[PDB]
Design a protein around this ligand. Structure first.
Ligand SMILES: [Zn+2]
Length: 133
């Protein structure tokens, strides 16, 4: 239990690379996160301190990780090539949790990243990452 006036918590980028696909419709279908493109193997980071709640195969994502942050927000890391965390593991903002995947397809290697306040519906990640404090 902590006493704090302003609730701000440190947030960092989940991966570095080209911003190739934003939140919203594309090719007639909603995209519920953002895509950040770079080579296979590019490190993927937890954006905020939190606890890993998923790490494994997922249909459609190939492999994924999810991290639950202490304010209840869940962040999602999809299309990873591999992950180095276990469910229940505590991670620090910016710590490497996975490597970028999406290999062998017409869409190049990238991270798919989602933000889910309260663990619920996804929101546009860009203001959540870039418009804080
Ligand atoms: Zn995506």
């Amino acid at each position: 239990l902590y006493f704090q006036s302003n609730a701000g918590q440190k947030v960092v980028l989940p991966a570095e690379g080209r911003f190739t696909s934003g939140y919203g419709p594309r090719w007639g279908r909603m995209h519920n996160g953002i895509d950040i493109a770079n080579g296979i193997g590019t490190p993927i980071y937890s954006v905020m301190d939190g606890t890993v709640i998923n790490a494994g195969p997922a249909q459609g994502f190939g492999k994924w990780v999810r991290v639950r942050h202490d304010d209840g927000t869940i962040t999602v890391y999809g299309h990873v090539h591999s992950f180095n965390v276990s469910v229940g593991q505590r991670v620090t903002a910016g710590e490497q949790i996975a490597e970028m995947g999406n290999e062998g397809q017409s869409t190049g290697p990238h991270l798919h990243f989602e933000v889910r306040p309260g663990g619920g519906d996804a929101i546009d990640p860009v203001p959540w990452l870039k418009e804080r404090g």
